Amino acid sequence: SSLDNIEMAYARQIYIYNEKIVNGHLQPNLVDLCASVAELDDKSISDMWTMVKQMTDVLLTPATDALKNRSSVEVRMEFVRQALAYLEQSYKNYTLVTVFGNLHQAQVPGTYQLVRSFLNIKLPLPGLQDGEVEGHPVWALIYYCMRCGDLLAASQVVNRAQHQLGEFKTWFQEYMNSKDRRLSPATENKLRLHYRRALRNNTDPYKRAVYCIIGRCDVTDNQSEVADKTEDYLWLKLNQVCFDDDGTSSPQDRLTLSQFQKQLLEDYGESHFTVNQQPFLYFQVLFLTAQFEAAVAFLFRMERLRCHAVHVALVLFELKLLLKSSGQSAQLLSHEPGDPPCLRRLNFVRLLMLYTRKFESTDPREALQYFYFLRDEKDSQGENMFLRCVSELVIESREFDMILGKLENDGSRKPGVIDKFTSDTKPIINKVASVAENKGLFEEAAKLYDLAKNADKVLELMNKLLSPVVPQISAPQSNKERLKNMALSIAERYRAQGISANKFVDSTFYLLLDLITFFDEYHSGHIDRAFDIIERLKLVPLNQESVEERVAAFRNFSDEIRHNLSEVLLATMNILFTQFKRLKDRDSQLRSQARTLITFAGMIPYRTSGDTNARLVQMEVLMN
């Protein structure tokens, strides 16, 4: 098996997810099934799924293309709110463990008191301004209340520092009471002027940071003294991004979400974030900024972490969030000319195929579960992608019994892996059989048509396969022996089970087998038994009385039968010629039969009739 513990754990979740789809039961959320796998791995994987769950928990318009939803301002703003919520709750957890040692012992206080207990450890310094509030510097209290996502707690601190904060009291009030955490253009410019004029080059880093979080200003300043870690930097910038240009505000000192997204993907990039040691940190950077496709593409190239990237993509696919490439030939990560900037396309088919191809040779059962995600996908020619992957896997692996089921001698069918995806498995088996047929795998196709109980196609292909080998020697491990044996198996099973194709195809098949028996007795030297066979077949005439009706019947015999007339005539003539020598009136009728064959041969057009008729007459001459 090529699947490791986590990869296999994921596969089981896909098995469960698919089982519910097929049986029309209440379908549990895939993200939840996948998140439970993090228990078997580090906290990075648990944190990844926690983030993914929150970033994809947004309100989407139903029955709508992912591009329309992903491009709407409502959805884009909700991604930011979900990212800010995650980053704020994450920091509040870091504060709970800092004060209580671990999240277990926190068993809860309000944000204001929690921050106070936190500053005892965080700030057990000179530059701070505007005094304290109940023992701790006011701006540190405000910043960390905001960093924990509790604006009400921050306002309580402001309400207790009205004295020295000045006009910031009313600015924070408007900010908190605004629905989108945004000041009015007039108050924002006022604050911005106040920041540039006075509070720039200030000694209280918390004051500067709080000011331009509220004012969404100094966007090139990362406030590193207080927002020293990557998540603090994401939280800061996401609080400052402006989505669309309203046409009235000044663009100076403004950070749009598009720029910020392109700064992290293009300008900074993998290298900046110490990528190999902390690939999940860059994945978080991309995913928290709603660059889902680029995030998946990035993590997918980390082959040790590829399963995580694939199953995040499956969640995005199932939630109708994923932006998919139009074609299967595009790169893994691409973009279309009319898509908004920073929105990218993921080649979903390619990503899934590259993943299954790692293990479909050793674990075909699992690969089939992942193929089912392509049941609604179509290839460049319009074929169902799930059936195409199934057909190719079946044909290339030759695991016909396991995947498609096993036909038993009594006509029953043992279920296969395919039975887990439907109850009407016959059309799928037939489809795979046709694919094998178009590829020239006629023996394989016939077996598959037999599994599908498609008698017309089985005997059609067997006629095509038997016809060339009818006169050949049934040598061990030869093509004729193999084809003859599977023809005898079919004949026996079909006779016992009462199965029959259309009369024309059906009679051709059993006549081809009867001729195979004729030649085998002939090649084995059983001249008399061979003669008894061909006579009972009433195929060629042995007396002038039967010549006319044999010529008539030959006009409706299949090309497969007509192709073998030459060898039937030669072998039959040699039988009469052999029986003639062994006598040395038995002669009159023996040479009369030979002359009947020549007469019959002359009235019938058949392959190689010139050289054959010559050889027949040459044997007759050695009898008269």
Tell me about the biggest sheet?
2 strands, antiparallel
The total beta strand count reads 8
Shape type: rod-shaped
Class of secondary structure makeup: mainly alpha
Distance between the termini: 74 Å
GO molecular function: structural constituent of nuclear pore
Keywords: Disease variant, Membrane, mRNA transport, Nuclear pore complex, Nucleus, Phosphoprotein, Protein transport, Translocation, Transport
Subcellular location: Nucleus membrane; Nucleus, Nuclear pore complex; Nucleus envelope
Organism: Homo sapiens
Overview of this protein structure:
The chain has 624 residues and is mainly α. It has a domain of 185 residues. The chain is 61% helix and 3% strand. It contains 32 helices and eight strands. The strands form four sheets. It has a two-stranded antiparallel ribbon. It has a two-stranded parallel sheet with strand order 3-4. Strands 5-6 form a two-stranded antiparallel sheet. A hairpin with a 2-residue loop joins strand 1 and strand 2. Plays a role in the nuclear pore complex (NPC) assembly and/or maintenance. May anchor nucleoporins, but not NUP153 and TPR, to the NPC. During renal development, regulates podocyte migration and proliferation through SMAD4 signaling. One of its GO terms (cellular component) is nuclear envelope. This is Nuclear pore complex protein Nup93. GO terms for molecular function: structural constituent of nuclear pore.
